[PDB]
């Protein structure tokens, strides 16, 4: 409980970093698709929301497998994050708002922040194994 | 959930490869006159859709179908060629060469961007695997 | 990344204008012919920001 609570903030921030990078990679993949508004999330507000109330999912519904021969299948399980629209910079005839400079800057920034989260969490866990080390 | 980036970027790479292949096929047949069925070659183009099943927020990209490009067939007056029309109007494909070259360049650039995404994601997964150690 | 498409549109429409001009020149001996005028119209893309 105590150890779970102490390591919960950085763990949740790192999970939200992973989901934000999934969203940014989806934006980069759809960069040439006509009629695709770029999506992004407000990291701070969603992070506070996930801490106060635990993580939740929109779908997740899956077939139950009582027997050992039942065929496993799942529908969709996306996070409960609010997918907001990014304000476009300049207009485009095809009708997508994925501006590549913004996408690649957010991608690199999210990359470094995820590495920072990994470093902090690893430092804390060593900072604990050091104590449990006699 | 960094594993889903593998699927997203792989789908994007496959779709961009298909788009580049279709563009190159159109470009290589700009001068064609005949098809396997005798019909004139019709310029073709892929359709990009969000690869998201119902209820999925954001996914990669997928090629729905390949469609004939909407443009008038280029009429050439050669009523000596064995293939011709009632008035000698040979029908040639409606390929716009500049458009195909720009499409090839764009597909290559998007492909390379997706490769970079995959590379950095794999590096992060390895780190993460080196979390506490 | 999308200025390439603006320039490509300009080049393709320049090709179209050249095709019109060449078709006009090919009929310098056509009896009772009327030349086709050509003009490049500008279409401004209307998004929200700039």
């Amino acid at each position: 409980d105590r150890l779970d609570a102490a390591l919960r903030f950085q763990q949740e921030a790192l999970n939200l970093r992973a989901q934000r990078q999934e969203i940014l990679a989806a934006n980069i993949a759809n960069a040439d698709t006509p009629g695709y508004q770029a999506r992004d999330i407000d990291f701070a507000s969603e992070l506070k929301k996930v801490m106060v109330r635990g993580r939740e999912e929109t779908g997740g519904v899956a077939l139950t497998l009582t027997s050992s021969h039942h065929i496993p299948a799942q529908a969709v399980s996306s996070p409960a994050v609010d997918l907001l629209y990014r304000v476009p910079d300049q207009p485009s005839l095809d009708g997508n708002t994925v501006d590549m400079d913004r996408e690649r800057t957010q991608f690199a920034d999210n990359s470094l922040k995820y590495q920072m989260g990994l470093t902090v969490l690893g430092s804390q866990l060593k900072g604990m194994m050091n104590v449990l080390q006699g | 959930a960094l594993l889903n980036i593998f699927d997203i970027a792989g789908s994007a790479l496959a779709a961009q490869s298909k788009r580049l292949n279709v563009a190159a096929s159109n470009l290589a047949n700009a001068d064609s006159v005949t098809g396997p069925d005798g019909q004139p070659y019709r310029a073709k183009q892929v359709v990009f859709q969000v690869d998201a099943a119902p209820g999925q927020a954001t996914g990669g990209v997928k090629v729905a179908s390949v469609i004939e490009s909407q443009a008038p067939e280029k009429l050439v007056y050669e009523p000596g060629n064995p293939l011709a029309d009632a008035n000698g109007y040979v029908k040639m494909p409606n390929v716009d060469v500049v458009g195909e070259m720009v499409n090839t360049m764009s597909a290559s650039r998007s492909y390379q961007a997706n490769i970079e995404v995959l590379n950095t994601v794999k590096s992060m997964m390895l780190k993460t695997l080196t979390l506490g150690q | 990344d999308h200025a390439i498409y603006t320039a490509m549109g300009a080049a393709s429409q320049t090709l179209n204008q050249q095709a019109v001009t060449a078709s006009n020149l090919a009929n310098a001996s056509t009896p009772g012919f009327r030349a086709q005028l050509n003009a490049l119209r500008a279409v401004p893309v209307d998004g929200l920001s700039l």
Binding site: T33, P34, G35, L93 | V50, N103, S106 | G9, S12
Partner: peptide
Amino acid sequence: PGGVPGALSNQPAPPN
């Protein structure tokens, strides 16, 4: 709703 990527959807389309 997607559409055709590249040249076709980035050239000025007919009005209707």
